[PDB]
Write a protein that binds this ligand. Sequence first.
Ligand SMILES: O[C@@H]1[C@@H](O)[C@H](O[C@@H]2CO[C@@H](O[C@@H]3CO[C@H](O)[C@H](O)[C@H]3O)[C@H](O)[C@H]2O)OC[C@H]1O
Length: 207
Amino acid sequence: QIVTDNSIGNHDGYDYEFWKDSGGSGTMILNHGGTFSAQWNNVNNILFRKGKKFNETQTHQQVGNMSINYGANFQPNGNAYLCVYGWTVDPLVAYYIVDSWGNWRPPGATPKGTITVDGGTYDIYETLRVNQPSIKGIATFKQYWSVRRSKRTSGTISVSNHFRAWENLGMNMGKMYEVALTVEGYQSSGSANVYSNTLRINGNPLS
Ligand SMILES: O[C@@H]1[C@@H](O)[C@H](O[C@@H]2CO[C@@H](O[C@@H]3CO[C@H](O)[C@H](O)[C@H]3O)[C@H](O)[C@H]2O)OC[C@H]1O
């Protein structure tokens, strides 16, 4: 179940992915269902996640209602995000629903709006990545952000509610590539134990 370099597969029903650029190290341990632990040290950029990868044919509306139940013991030692992350293609977009963070609340841009959902209020942002790594190679793509105003590390994230808020604000989404409970570390060290993580699509826990 121990993963310490770039790897994409399926484990216990969930699509897991370990990704880092060069520098420092990380360890991901694949636990039951959507659960996993992560540890990272002196990295530049590292991401650990479990959720679902899609075959790039369906809008989020066609996939259906997405909802994630999670619980994490999150102990970043610097910059890091506890979130729901994923991709669409055509257009190519990386997205983030951030529930907790380390020392710096991302993503440093000007808010475009808010959505009040799952007991909290989130600021909505849109940023741009120029010739950076992506699921399609070195590319230029927008990132979409919902970042909670106060930290939390457990509860329900109503993914489709953020996707509708973004498209309401003019932040359009393509065909789904992935949705996943994600721990991301940036220029830092730390650990996180995701002890609970269930993805529901139209009410049914993933299969
Ligand atoms: O083999 C390919 C993998 O290498 C590829 O990995 C993706 C690379 O890009 C990552 O995203 C970047 C870093 O994290 C934030 O989104 C940054 O802002 C993005 O630049 C993806 O997380 C990795 O999954 O994916 C496709 C696989 O075929």
